[PDB]
């Protein structure tokens, strides 16, 4: 007979199966669409999650109760040391989909990439690219391959890698990513632009801008094996139940004589590949600037690094980006940033007035160590 009262199912069936991610890191499945004639630009970057904090801003939002006053907002900091371009890959559109044409590697490759090619660098015999680097000493081979790409490709991407030596991480091998080149008037313009920045650093300042929106892709926090109450959010059973009350009472009808895939069961929770969309950029700066986080209402110079350090993360050494809200993952998890595909239309402009830099280790009340020393008669 029919269920007496109305209620929806619990959980989203579009995120199945709930299994540990088998991809090494967060990967960019799709890139923003390419429109001919727009200025040529890059579409993505890779960084590391560092922390969260406060900001006070001024809201100019016509038609809302916030239109002429202040608001306290949550922000997230992502550490973005420069990336090195090192290869060019071209694709051709085909009846079978996107097929690679060829990939051309630079004459000289840095140690982090070489490390990425092995499992144990100290013991491994160093043979990767040993023959290739002799062939490509002169520019002739590179030119021939780029001519091939110019005459046969439809989509152009570059290959860049991170520099973990500029971070507090323990890892020494780098992360290799493909980044698409959008814009221009033809494929030749794209190929020349990509060739103009080979073996060169790329800064996040040249990819994103303040006030635009981005998508973030990462892997969420892990929890191991978990029960239905926490894994799927079903109701607990009453106290008098024999054999406990954290479970689903009925897991099916008599017919069909099987268990359906739509019924909640226990298993792995967390460590999933996820993507949050439409996050607004608040600030792009570098930790090498002493007035990094000083505004019109402040006096003493304050930088990004808080008093006592970023908890469970080293100190930030260089460039970084600030976004509004939250992103998946814990601290130190690699994060891929990407231009938004379907941005939100009505976003008020960003107008920072004050940034909180107190100690997040405990409850701190001093924005700088000099103020603390003054206070404690030190």
């Amino acid at each position: 007979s029919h269920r007496k009262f109305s209620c929806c199912r619990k959980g989203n069936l579009g995120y199945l199966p709930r299994k540990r991610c088998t991809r090494g890191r967060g990967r960019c499945k799709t890139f923003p669409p390419d429109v001919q004639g727009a200025p040529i630009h890059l579409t993505a970057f890779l960084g590391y999650k560092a922390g969260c904090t406060h900001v006070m801003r001024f809201i100019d939002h016509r038609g809302s109760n916030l239109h002429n006053r202040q608001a306290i907002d949550q922000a997230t900091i992502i550490d973005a040391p420069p990336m090195i371009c090192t290869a060019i890959i071209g694709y051709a559109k085909t009846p079978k989909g996107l097929r690679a044409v060829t990939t051309v590697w630079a004459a000289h490759i840095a140690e982090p990439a070489m490390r990425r090619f092995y499992r144990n660098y100290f013991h491994a015999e160093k043979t990767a690219f040993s023959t290739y680097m002799k062939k490509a000493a002169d520019g002739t081979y590179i030119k021939e391959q780029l001519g091939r790409l110019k005459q046969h490709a439809d989509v152009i991407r570059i290959v860049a890698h991170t520099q973990p030596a500029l971070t507090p991480l323990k890892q020494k091998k780098a992360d290799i990513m493909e980044i698409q080149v959008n814009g221009g008037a033809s494929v030749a313009e794209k190929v020349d632009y990509a060739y103009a920045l080979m073996e060169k650093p790329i800064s996040i300042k040249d990819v994103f801008s303040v006030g635009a929106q981005i998508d973030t892709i990462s892997i969420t926090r892990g929890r191991g094996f978990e029960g239905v109450v926490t894994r799927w959010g079903v109701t607990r059973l009453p106290r008098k139940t024999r054999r406990g009350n954290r479970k689903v009472a009925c897991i099916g009808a008599w017919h069909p004589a099987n268990v359906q895939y739509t019924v909640a069961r226990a298993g792995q929770m967390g460590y999933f590949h996820r993507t949050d969309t439409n996050k607004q950029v608040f600030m792009i700066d570098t930790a090498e600037n002493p007035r990094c986080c000083t505004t019109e209402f402040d006096l003493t110079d304050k930088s990004i690094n808080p008093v006592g350090g970023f908890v469970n993360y080293g100190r930030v050494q260089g460039d970084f980006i600030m976004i509004k809200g939250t992103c998946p993952g814990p601290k130190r998890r690699p994060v891929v940033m990407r231009n938004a595909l379907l941005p939100h239309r009505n976003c008020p402009p960003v107008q920072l007035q004050w940034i909180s830099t107190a100690s997040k280790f405990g409850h701190g009340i001093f924005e700088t160590v000099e103020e603390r020393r003054q206070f404690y008669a030190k």
């Binding site: 406060h54 006070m56 306290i72 209402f297 402040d298 007035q353 004050w354 909180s356 107190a358 409850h363 009340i365 924005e367």
Partner: protein
């Protein structure tokens, strides 16, 4: 930020977005720095004998 408040119980400085405020029936507004302060006040513990507060340091002469 220039505009900061003072804790009602301990006399310390509070930064934007960092505590809670209570309104009493007598129409008086109390501002607290953390949960430790609000528990001290709610239990009616005299701040003049809690040695880390400003009220206590003034009575001792350490603070002028």
């Amino acid at each position: 930020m220039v505009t900061t408040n003072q804790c009602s119980y301990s006399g310390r400085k509070i930064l934007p977005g960092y505590g809670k405020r209570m309104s009493r029936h007598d129409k008086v507004l109390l501002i607290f720095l953390n949960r430790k302060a609000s528990v001290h006040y709610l239990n009616k513990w005299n701040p003049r004998k809690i040695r880390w507060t400003l009220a206590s340091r003034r009575a001792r002469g350490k603070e002028v």
